[PDB]
């Protein structure tokens, strides 16, 4: 009986620690996955904007080339 009483309270401790552990891990995964997703969306936005700047450099180049002709 004493052995069973020890196993019950050890079970209660193990379940509580596993609940804490899994909650900590799930939240770490979500915050890291969210951080990467948002950073990727911002990177795509700036990449499109930089391509517009690249296009503007090509336009001003095209004007200078036809002026030399």
């Amino acid at each position: 009986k004493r052995e069973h009483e020890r196993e019950v309270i050890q079970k209660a401790i193990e379940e509580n620690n596993n609940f804490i552990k899994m909650a900590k891990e799930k939240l770490a995964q979500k915050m890291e996955s969210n951080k990467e997703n948002r950073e990727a969306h911002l990177a795509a936005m700036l990449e499109r904007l930089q391509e517009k700047d690249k296009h503007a450099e090509e336009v001003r180049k095209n004007k200078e080339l036809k002026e030399e002709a």
């Binding site: 936005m45 700036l46 904007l49 517009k52 700047d53 503007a56 336009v59 095209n62 004007k63």
Partner: protein, 426 residues
């Protein structure tokens, strides 16, 4: 403090921008000298959204004035509130755009854009927590359309997590004789669809029709049209400038109004519209939903509402406002999409605008806005099939393919509005 940085570019943008600052300065009790002389603490509670505070208890508009010619900005400085703007915030060129979007976007505008960004950066660095930006400009000209959309993209690169809002004046042959305005407007819409979060479509076509048909003005001046613009701009910024619960900042407004990122072009409305020489809550509500009161030449009964913001100003029964807003939705349920429940939000501000006991301002995201874009696309393709005056644009470095891309992207926008107009819940 949630600051907004205001930018006005080109002749139209600086003109409607100056009237905006005149109207809201009077509303907040600010005189041309920048001193406060109001009588209500509600005038100053959110004053920092649009005004910087300086030495001597003086309030300075957080405004930046841009143009490729000094003409309009000299007359601004000679205006009634001309001495209230920060002198260093005047950024002007000498060449001019000449109604050429290419010069504004790629050539003359690109040579001045960095000096404008230095002023934007200065005003943004001193903000407690910057909300974003509002830009006033026209799409039919050269500077406001070309350089204005260039400024949006460059500012977007340095403030990508901030809200970009524009008051964009749509061209109409009823107002301006310039025949290449469909070019400049389409090229601008190509940029606004990608780089702004919310755009108020101020349609010169609607402004002329209101002045002529409703206000009985045989010869509407730009001052007559701008009176409607200033009253509209005051109404759609009321929730940003006075204490309130609904749409109190640019981002909450966008989250309530924009269900899909590209569909961010709003149909403004105002009530009452009465001529100088000629009101209940039910009448005020019915008029703000009437097509004759829309600042965009579109009939909302030709489409469906995705989202609506309504703003009532003045002392009135909030119970009656609630009943009338419920009544107009129930009686017109066909014109509101059923797959966005509770898509109409209502705000009530106790302070009425100057000269009115009660007023209502309407902000609609309606699929009927495609009528405005179809009108521009029809005038665009009639010019582009003849390639009229293309050499002015290609002479700056552009080519016809960029014109084709702008036309297709705007045509896609129309197709997308029609898609969600046709969508159903079941």
């Amino acid at each position: 403090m949630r600051e907004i940085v205001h930018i006005q570019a080109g002749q139209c943008g600086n003109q409607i921008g100056a009237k905006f600052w005149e109207v809201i300065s009077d509303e907040h009790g600010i005189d041309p000298t920048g001193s406060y002389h109001g009588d209500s603490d509600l005038q100053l509670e959110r004053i920092n959204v649009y005004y910087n505070e300086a030495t001597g208890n003086k309030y300075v508009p957080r405004a930046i004035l841009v143009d490729l010619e000094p003409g309009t900005m000299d007359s601004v400085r000679s205006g009634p509130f001309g001495q209230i703007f920060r002198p260093d915030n005047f950024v002007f060129g000498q060449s001019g755009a000449g109604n050429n979007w290419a010069k504004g976007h790629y050539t003359e505008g690109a040579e001045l854009v960095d000096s404008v960004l230095d002023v934007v950066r200065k005003e943004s660095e001193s903000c407690d927590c910057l909300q974003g930006f509002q830009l006033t400009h026209s799409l039919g000209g050269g500077t406001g359309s070309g350089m204005g959309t260039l400024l949006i993209s460059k500012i977007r690169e340095e403030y990508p997590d901030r809200i970009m809002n524009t008051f964009s004046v749509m061209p109409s042959p009823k107002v301006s004789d310039t025949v290449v305005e469909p070019y400049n407007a389409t090229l601008s819409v190509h940029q606004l669809v990608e780089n702004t979060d919310e755009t108020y479509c101020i349609d010169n076509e609607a402004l002329y029709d209101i002045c002529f048909r409703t206000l009985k003005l045989t010869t509407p001046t730009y001052g007559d049209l701008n009176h409607l613009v200033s009253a509209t701009m005051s109404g759609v910024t009321t929730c940003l400038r006075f204490p309130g619960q609904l749409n109190a900042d640019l981002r909450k407004l966008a989250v309530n109004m924009v269900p899909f990122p590209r569909l961010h072009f709003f149909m403004p409305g105002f009530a009452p519209l009465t001529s100088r020489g000629s009101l209940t809550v039910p009448e005020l509500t019915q008029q703000m939903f009437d097509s004759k009161n829309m600042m965009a030449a579109c009939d909302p009964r030709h489409g469906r509402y995705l989202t609506v913001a309504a703003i009532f100003r003045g002392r009135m029964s909030m119970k009656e406002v609630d009943e009338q807003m419920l009544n107009v939705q129930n009686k017109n349920s066909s014109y509101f999409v059923e797959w966005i429940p509770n898509n109409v939000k209502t705000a009530v501000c106790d302070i009425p605008p100057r000269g009115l006991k009660m007023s209502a301002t309407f902000i609609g995201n309606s699929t009927a806005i495609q009528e405005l874009f179809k009108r521009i696309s029809e005038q665009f393709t009639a010019m582009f099939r003849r390639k009229a005056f293309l050499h002015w644009y290609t002479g700056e470095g552009m080519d016809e393919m960029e014109f084709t891309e702008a036309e297709s992207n705007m045509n896609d926008l129309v197709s997308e509005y029609q898609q969600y107009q046709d969508a159903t819940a079941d």
